[model samples]
Target: SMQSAANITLRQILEPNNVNLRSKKTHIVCTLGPACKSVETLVKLIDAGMDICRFNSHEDHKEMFNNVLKAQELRCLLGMLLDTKGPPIISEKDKNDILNFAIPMCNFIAASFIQSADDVRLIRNLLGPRGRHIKIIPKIENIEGIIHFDKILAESDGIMIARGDLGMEISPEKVFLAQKLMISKCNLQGKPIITATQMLESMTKNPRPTRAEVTDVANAVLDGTDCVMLSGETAGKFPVEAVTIMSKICLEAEACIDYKLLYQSLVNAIETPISVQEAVARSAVETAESIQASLIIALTETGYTARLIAKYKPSCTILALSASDSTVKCLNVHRGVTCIKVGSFTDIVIRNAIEIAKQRNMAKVGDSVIAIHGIKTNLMKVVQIE
Candidate 1:
């Protein structure tokens, strides 16, 4: 149903006329494939209003990832998010050879094969200390990953429910379970969980989602997923507009969804859960909205806190700052988030937020704004700069 509308839109973008008209509100994330690798092409994509760039770690080798990482910086402006191949819930990848040991009948990989805390530690190291801005999503794709989640989540900044491949690896039944489990884990950790892949695969070329697709998208909202990622469906032809419409659908559906129940379910997931991160994020947004804060600076190592704020559907401008350029870039990919990569926790992040607010005419020098931190806070209470 929606695909037909999308089909018309896709045809429009490829044509010489109406290209700029369609690009206005569209948010493109031109994937770094062979056709889109050149700087000139990338600039054109940006001029076409590509909002975010995604780098899949599994698809590219280290060299390719590094080159694109560097290429994204050439503009130093476009938002980026680097997705790591996370723990396999079932490990069915023929290329990685990880699935060579899955249970024959069940298609389940063992916990031992799943990435350990040490692996996350390594991921953090690669994420580096300056990674507060760049967000990382340890995408859970298999069953073992879902089972040993506590161990894996502690080391991860965020979890992504990569449904398409994950569903293929496991079964639809298991996919639903895994989605619930990992989403709760992210909520407990105060990290964000992204629901990705096939959100409306059939509707990519259609104008409206199927009734089933509508339910699927709404279910993710009810589950409190921070973002729904659109892959090839948007990137292929319809481009940014496809994703923007998806965002609209999610927002509209979420209006009547029961988020409080989702919150409680998220809280019940962990025996010894960390609530400060989640609380602080929610609190800051509430406070910001009440005060009509001109700008809210969300400081995060993995960009969780910032993501949490974004999910609240706040009206204020959010300055999502991270120590990691990658995280900053990644957060940019999310809807309604404006990102900036900073050097350190105190100096760069604070200054950057202030300057951005001023530039946007959202805040003046004397005006006060709320800032949120991902890790330990100096005080549990809010502070005043002046």
Candidate 2:
């Protein structure tokens, strides 16, 4: 899963002796295009902290198809995704052929302007059983997606709040609540949620982002979104730098998160009985927080436990170790988690896990790391890096 978003190893810049070894937790979804179409630019973008690459193809298409193709062939380590262009007019409506080609290579399929659970389920039907492994991230861009939000949320593997078309479908002021409400609910349910649209729009042409644009990115981070997306900004002139700044903003915003309040609210938010899986997942984050741990490591089978731990918003970065390829790619957009894939449940769980952390400079000797691995059926134990 090192090829996943957590795949990119940016140089950790921090003051000496700081227990928080690395910075930047949130995933950055950069839309590929006009300027950044070469392999060099793509690697540089990933180097600059761009996690998932969203390529806009069908619906009157012209995109960097060659770039992504070369990317995969070039020993590439990236999360590649195909976006289903918003509810289309008759001219560019069909993307079925495109989806067919993507089944083997891509792990994520985002259905744009998805208005209902039926729209989501229909996308699932088209994928067939094997294709069902692809994570369906529904783009909520209209009144129907809003009106039937809960149903779609239940059916969705994840949610993308695409505010561009979303604002047009409703009043301008109302979009804020739509964004706020959806992101919070998605978090509550332990599903991946992304905040997209004009996050760093001005940066598309300019070298730097606007003050308001900075706030917009910060607000999304504080709102507890798993990811923040850049459309035109990444496809434009300063693509790499846009990602750099977004990374910078997220690091700062994440620094301000009130872990105590967030975890407390998350645990008590729902009174419904949780599965035993969730019960242990919930316990993992709380343990790491109280002990001032450096990392929370989850040995996930399906990325289920990892997702639940992520939603709890632990102060430490979660290292979700899995042998499942699908689980690795799927965790690309999950906030506060870095998925690492290892060989078939190699017996040395804690020692090797700690060694990998040391290699990444994620922790120093004497640091405390919580390992949420299972044969526990489930267990959450704190291991010292020493």
Candidate 3:
């Protein structure tokens, strides 16, 4: 949701405890769709305690993207973190014709990479050269995309395995393999992989999650998925209740899940082959830990920068900041990240972060803090203060 009058009003719905409840200092992500798009809606999302907004690049227009940007101006004025939406690899216009189009799974399978490239270039353009202000996340769903995961992750800031369309475009068996491959790929890159699509789909209709749903979510948690996400479960017919329930499930699962296997696998993957960004982000966490910083503010456009920090489990709030209101609202299901919106780059970045803490009662003035940004084109740099 772009910053709109509605978002400002939405702020009324939140209590301070909602913003940083766990005390673990995790991050949160929201998606900017019809549910949240206007300045008012964005304000509500940010104030409600979203850490970032994920703008689905697939099947959306630039004008809408611009609106998100425009709303961020208000966030900046008010002191919020703004993130940009990462482009989506959508089924081509021709393929989406549905009744008029063939919608062949083959065409979708073959051209996924081509479409992915298009999405990346558009994401790059959206984030611009100095990506420090925004982060891009390229979601992988199709088989082709899975096979080419390494290349795709290399080009994008983060990766999310979106299975909504994954189920629609490939066989269930293929989708499962794709999911495994994607998790491994992201693990190798040290990029956070958000396991999405029905970690609790049954809840959309049922009052409770299915046993399979519980096991599925538990599997992802045990799979070392840095972040577990819920789609229809959160933003569908049920709103806040759905999100709260989903969060409960994750908390319950994480509390009892076997992490030894997952951690070993995740570490092995990274050591086998890794990206420089992964190493850089990992190093940053070590530095932050050594210094005992309480929160890490990440300037991301597509939510990638913040997710990178999250993958390493910083013992603080990973404040995912961006300028895109849509991106800021899309992080609701990201498990971590307290998404915020702020206007364009200004001397106020730190000021705005502190205010968010105040609004959520997470911090008070005179407290030391850490800030970092991932430049799409070397745009971000790290800094610290008291």
Candidate 4:
């Protein structure tokens, strides 16, 4: 019965054409624990729209490493985020335990209790053989971390605005101010930052989320967080429900977002011109919005272009078509990106994206869809479904 039910449930979400038209643009990060660590459950979560897999450093290293291996073996297209233990509470023994365990296994290592650039240096140095490959994400929490924010962030590949501990370290009222500053800094550097913790806390006990929780999640999206995370909510009894609810909220919030204005504001914040690809990505979204295109499809072999478009956080659906299985899987971690594997070649990639969009009811006959193709020249066009 479990397998039978799982098949039906998972198929409903994972099936290419069955992608929820109501799906939101913001990425979702779900924490894995004993309750949902099985291959069956993990697959189901991926199908249900989980973008990244988070391993809490507080958990057993061997156990976490085993789960990471399991997810990899299953070929799940999810980013591996290793969340570290932070300070005041971070003894060297505890810190080394997680660093030794995580450095080699994760795509991104998020150092918690980050107080200064010195702490970041230790994390960067600990990457060993995989040092160049692994990205460092500084988790900003506590007063000292905030004081040295610029220095720590400069060394970071990305950042985690860990509000749970931040609010605990500072005051609740001050958390909002801190998040605003951190998100802005990450935006200026053109690096991704995740707004984490207590996104839907009430759902841990109750079947429904509180009104405040809905507002909280929406505000984070509006604030420009590349991703929003679920802690106990996903690791608890109603993982599926939590994800479903979060998805609904993201779509609703995104629908009302002013993409052009938002993009312009972000562009202004950096005080510099964007790259050619970045400018093209912004124009593609703006073009889609102006013409009211049904969808924006990006053809990428390495997933870089699609990610560039996603960084702009377009209000429209972005379907990334790729030839590489690894590229398709990796795109799952980017906000607003839905990926599908297709054969190489220019026309075929465009044809498949349009065909899939139509089949999924994402677009209809006579509806306009914008396509961005090729890496060398960066070709972009608008086509109508025939």
Candidate 5:
């Protein structure tokens, strides 16, 4: 019953269910492997609520990357991530693969064990020109990464708290302090941050996760990381089951978030002379809250508007319509966003967007919807689903 198209959609996230899958905004990234490699299984993973599909092993890397990309083309909503093996002892072949192979394909290149801005530069230089659009998610594992985080964050697209390597770099127990440090920093900067490593680790071999595993997933969501990832858990015997359990945990953790306080705090966190785009996105969130609208639609050119709204963290899913396929793919990793590739944006485009929202079950007759549009993002309006 839950088999979904390649991408997670507004319809999927807000689809009414007894399990409270509805109204949960956190994004889930699943690592690809034999257990969930086929198109059939990938589709099921999407329905189970995985927003991004990742590649890490490089154990027959090319076929798996091509296979997942083939699956991604089916709907264009699954974000493809190629996880680099860090700088520690990586092969020249691995470095060449990133430049010659991955740069042309991936939506994100997560450089592992990133210890400095220079590490991001290493990947960026390899990406050269084609990767201008690809996101670089640097994994902060070593203590040097912690020391130069602000510079690393400034040089990169976003961050990942790679706790396994991080624990080894610092006292294991002190990793919690580092987690809070990075999550809050990204929160203030409005960058999409992912909390990763060892989440649901016990589930890789077992049908059920430990009680500690359950709370750990929930706590990551509560900490305001835009995405929670599954590593070995998705390669497990019960990969689909692990995804199902993770979705449930997200719903429960989101229930604990104080939406009002989060909104207020984000507002308090912005800098001097806010840009017009940021100004408009903030208004859309505020208006949606006041009207209790069922959905927010962003008619964007680059997916920038959608990213801004996600930073504010609204309760409703933002359905982002972009003509660019790359824009849609880049948006897959953001929290609370479900992107669709549209042809063009005349009023014809606007009407179709509203109609699709209803068809997808994002709204119902008489329910309110908010739309914030374009590079200007200046045009804002509310519609009632009919």
Candidate 6:
């Protein structure tokens, strides 16, 4: 079973020197607050499968800054996500906005209540040089956002279906359709999409998630979300348990995901068409699945190839190795991607990858693995483990 293989790879990667190898993949975002603010807790959370640290810009600036610094000091490959209160109607309301409240250090700026391209540009401009390269995630919360979905999506680096506010603005029954539309649009644009809010709401108060909550999360993954976010579920009561449960749900859901259906969806939604690089990435994943390859190793200098591969939502693990620390950190937010900072030269990189795969137990002597490199020159080849 894939899960069994994944488990072995994960064990090997986490403790390669010991024994065994296994694997798994999915992006998990956990909100940081009083309950889970300490560096010690943050370290444990990241170690326990927390891929991104989420901060509510509506909170205290000093506290957010401190948490950001703490995470950077730890030097883990965890991405920072800053969720903001969207554009204000007037100057007075603007004071509390994420733009004016604080400029927290983040890899992704999640602008809530996004209404139009103007709002997206405003956030981008306000961010200035420091944020030029950072990804912008537009949160679809209000009716205005839905009304201007196309323009917002065009300007967005990613999209978030903020169901909490959307449910209130639109009918609860309609929110599901809205989610479907939002996801479809993002997929069409080849942008990363996140289904957020109330996914595991029950977990905030109870350790066990309701059957409905479980289905809600599973359906989101099946619906093709690049990432799943935890809000009050992590900030309210059970921080560690919330993450643990969410991680388990993501993996279990991914195990049964219909890649064929996903491929059809991707093929059907491409109005703008895909580039040659994208085509290669798509084929690599499809080929890996066809051959049941143990892992896909992408040698990247800027993390582009890795991000492209992740968008395919391939069944096997993706080990993205790069020589640049910045490139490795940039990939933290990508779904199904595990970034490793490594040395130069194709042979050295591939050898290290094989060693890591063997040590982590993701592959054995006879298992096949695919290596992709030269995003510029476009080289891909298959190799068997020694």
Per-residue lDDT of model 3, residues 1-386, tens digit only: 13332333333334322332243222334444554545666554443334434433333524444555566565522112222222334333423321122121001111233334556665355333443333345555456666666667787646666566666778766666666767766655656555545566776677776777777765676455655554554444443444455454445444443333443444555556667666666666666566666667777787667767766655556677788765565443344466777776534876677776766666655555667665654333444434
Per-residue alpha-carbon lDDT of candidate 1 for residues 165-187, written as tens digits (9 for 90 to 100): 56777866666776776765565
Best by lDDT: 5
The whole-model C-alpha lDDT of candidate 3 against the native structure comes to 0.52
Superposed by TM-score, candidate 5 places the C-alpha of residue 365 at a distance from the truth, in angstroms, of 1.2
The model with the greatest TM-score is 5
- After superposing candidate 3 on the true structure, give the runs of residues whose Cα lies further than 4 Å from its correct spot: 1-142, 156-158, 162-177, 190-192, 226-237, 252-283, 290-292, 298-311, 320-335, 339-352, 364-368, 371-386
Cα error, candidate 4, residue 348 (Å) = 1.9
TM-score of each: 0.58, 0.88, 0.54, 0.78, 0.90, 0.84
Q: Which stretches of candidate 1 lie over 4 Å from their true place?
A: 1-31, 34-52, 56-137, 168-174, 203-215, 251-286, 289-294, 299-317, 322-327, 330-337, 342-355, 358-368, 372-386
Model 2 spans > 4 angstroms off: 1-22, 57-77, 86-98, 345-347
Task: Give the better candidate number (1 or 3) by lDDT.
Answer: 1
lDDT tens digits by residue: candidate 5, 141-206: 788889999999988888887777778869866878888888888987878888876688777888
| TM-score, ranked from best to worst | 5, 2, 6, 4, 1, 3
lDDT of 4 by residue, 1-386 (tens): 23433334443445434347236578888887775667666666665667777877345646755765676567524677777665554557545654566553556667777888887777666655566556677777678988998898887777888776778878667768888888877766667788886689888877789999998998888777778898998777777778878877776556556666666776677647677877888789889888999888998877778877776766678898887765675565466777888875477678777887777667889988899975758778988889
Cα misplacement distance, residue 79 of candidate 5 (Å) = 0.3
Worst 10 residues of 2 by lDDT: 1-10
Question: Each model's C-alpha lDDT?
Answer: 0.54, 0.76, 0.52, 0.73, 0.79, 0.73
Off by over 4 Å in 4: 1-22, 57-76, 86-106, 116-122, 128-133, 322-333, 341-345, 373-376
- Backbone clashes in candidate 5 total 0
Cα lDDT of model 6 by residue, 299-369, tens digit: 98978888778777777788999987667766766667777788664877888888977776677898889
TM-score of candidate 3 versus the correct structure, residues matched by position: 0.54
